[PDB]
């Protein structure tokens, strides 16, 4: 069963907002990335020989390249200013829950945004950086994240601390 | 303070399905996609519409150009099986409404057939679906959803069919 | 007053070249 796919991903990369912006346009045919436009290069560059005809074609056209090089400004920085109003400052407060399993203490951190988070297990007020098992950051696909940070010990007062950009102060849940 | 983000416009055209898609991505999440057949902008979260807007006919034009380019790419010159993970969105409590997530990942071409199964029979209600989402590489991922009421009597399956599969697989889930 | 988004307009690529 043959199939054919023309796939293009135009990526705006912001290393610190609009202070440093890099445009990366990536062309794909079937399972193969063949062409790229890096704004740090200024021209098209073939990733594979299939993309070379398009590179030589478009790179020989001054006006094309001129419009491309400006898209760091005309498209990337244009859209960032807009998204900076609701996407960048978006904050969803995490729900934290502790429950035993099998022992295995489970700290469930649910429905939070953005993904930047830090979860620590404490034993009697002292951090435990050993025996930790995690599912890692899990993307729910609806702009929320979840994660399971589990401690693998046999118990007096265990504590799970969660730090997050949506919190002015760390959230704490204890388990006696 | 430092704000690092990656906004991605992702579009494609597929043969012989003759289907095209167009979407924006923000740090891994969908901002919106354009319904090509209806020429309308579909936001991932409804609230987004108060802040931004997109002229959907712009995407229709791109797909028209992509469709023509695909013919060029065809003249100029296997399948990848998906990973399927079935999990809950929130911690599962009996009697407390929740959502099962069927995560299809690392596959190509962007065409799948997903069927939610409650107790061995299909479910057409309370089911949600995403468009084909971008990855860092050349492959796609996709989210399928099912609202459900947790109980010890029920078991769930997510049946995913793809051209990269000799046989449709079903990932199981129960309380 | 929702701000209109900008987007990348796709480009036409030509034929006339073949690969083995």
């Amino acid at each position: 069963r043959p199939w054919f796919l023309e796939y293009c991903k135009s990526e705006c990369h912001f290393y610190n907002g609009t202070q440093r912006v890099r445009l990366l346009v990536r062309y794909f045919y079937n399972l193969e990335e063949n062409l790229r436009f890096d704004s740090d290069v200024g021209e098209f560059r073939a990733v594979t020989e299939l993309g070379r005809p398009d590179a030589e074609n478009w790179n020989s056209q001054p006006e094309f390249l001129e419009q491309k090089r400006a898209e760091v400004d005309t498209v990337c920085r244009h859209n960032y200013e807009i998204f900076d109003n609701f996407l960048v400052p978006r904050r969803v407060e995490p729900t934290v829950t502790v429950y035993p399993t099998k022992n295995l203490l489970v700290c469930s951190v649910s429905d939070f945004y953005p993904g930047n988070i830090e979860v620590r297990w404490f034993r009697n007020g002292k951090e435990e950086k050993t025996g930790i098992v995690s599912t890692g950051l899990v993307r729910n696909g609806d702009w929320t994240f979840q994660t399971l940070v589990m401690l693998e010990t046999v118990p007096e007062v265990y504590t799970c601390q969660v730090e997050h950009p949506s919190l002015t102060d760390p959230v704490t849940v204890e388990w006696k | 303070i430092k704000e690092e983000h990656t906004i991605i416009q992702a579009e494609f055209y597929l043969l012989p399905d003759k289907r095209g898609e167009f979407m924006f991505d923000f740090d891994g999440d969908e901002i919106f996609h354009v319904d090509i057949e209806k020429s309308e902008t579909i936001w991932r979260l409804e609230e987004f519409a108060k802040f931004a807007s997109f002229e959907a006919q712009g995407a229709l034009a791109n797909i028209a150009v992509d469709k023509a380019n695909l013919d060029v790419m065809k003249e100029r010159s296997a399948n990848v099986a998906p990973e399927v993970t079935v999990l809950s969105r929130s911690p599962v409590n009996l009697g407390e409404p929740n959502i099962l997530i069927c995560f299809i990942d690392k596959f190509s071409p962007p065409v799948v057939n997903v069927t939610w199964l409650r107790n061995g029979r299909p479910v057409t209600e309370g089911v949600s679906e995403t468009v084909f989402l971008p990855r860092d590489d050349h492959l796609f991922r996709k989210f399928h959803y099912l609202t459900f009421l947790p109980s010890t009597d029920d078991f769930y399956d997510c049946e995913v069919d793809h051209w990269g599969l000799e046989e449709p697989l079903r990932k199981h889930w129960e309380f | 007053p929702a701000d209109p988004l900008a987007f990348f307009s796709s480009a036409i690529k030509g034929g006339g070249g073949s690969l083995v």
Partner: T-cell receptor, first 115, second 109 residues
């Protein structure tokens, strides 16, 4: 330099008559545009082409106009039923690319629709 | 939307002036035309950034500040005509040039 050919230079029609205008894009240009320029120097986009295929057109063009860009024949724009408000300079433009570089305009057709 | 100024300009032969266009939204690139007596649009400039120079003409376009200019020096008789700026809306779905009001330029012999 790209040259775009348009015929006829001038054109007069009575209300209800068809008004056909022809255009020959620059050799090698796959993309063709049509604009309206009235007496107030206002420009209105009508329709664009990628080779033989119509890609975009406004509502007025779909209902009242009939545009075509076949091989074996020059491009054409035709008003099916000419009205007084159709009187304008109909400009044809071709481009090497879809939206990435300069559009080159022809001499245009000065259409005048009388009662 | 595009705002062009001045509406009209009468320049003595051999002297110079400048036209301006402000854009209310983001433009991918700007085109400058001269529409002569015949009514045919002559391409003067295409620029998506910076400054370009073409004979006695000169043009600057700044995407961030959303404006473009056209400078005319040493005015000749053939410079007469209506000058238009035109740009592509980067936020526009319809692929088209959006034109300015126009500058009707007359050269005093």
């Amino acid at each position: 330099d790209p040259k775009v050919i348009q015929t006829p230079r001038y054109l007069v029609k009575g209300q209800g008559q068809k008004a056909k205008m022809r255009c020959i894009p620059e050799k090698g240009h796959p993309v063709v545009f049509w604009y309206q320029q009235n007496k107030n120097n206002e420009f209105k986009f009508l329709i664009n082409f990628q080779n033989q295929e119509v890609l975009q057109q406004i509502d007025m063009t779909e209902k009242r106009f009939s545009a075509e860009c076949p091989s074996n024949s020059p491009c054409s724009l035709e008003i099916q039923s000419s009205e007084a408000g159709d009187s304008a300079l109909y400009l044809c433009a071709s481009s090497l690319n879809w939206s990435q570089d300069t559009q080159y305009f022809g001499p245009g057709t000065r259409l005048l629709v009388l009662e | 939307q595009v705002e062009q100024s001045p509406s009209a300009l009468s320049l003595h032969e051999g002297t110079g002036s400048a036209l301006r266009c402000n854009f209310t939204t983001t433009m991918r690139a700007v085109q400058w035309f001269q529409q002569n007596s015949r009514g045919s649009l002559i391409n003067l400039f295409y620029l998506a950034s910076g400054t370009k120079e073409n004979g006695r003409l000169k043009s600057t376009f700044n995407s961030k500040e959303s404006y473009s200019t056209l400078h005319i020096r040493d005015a000749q008789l053939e410079d007469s005509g209506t000058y238009f700026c035109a740009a592509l809306r980067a936020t526009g779905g319809n692929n088209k040039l959006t034109f300015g009001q126009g500058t009707v330029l007359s050269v005093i012999p």
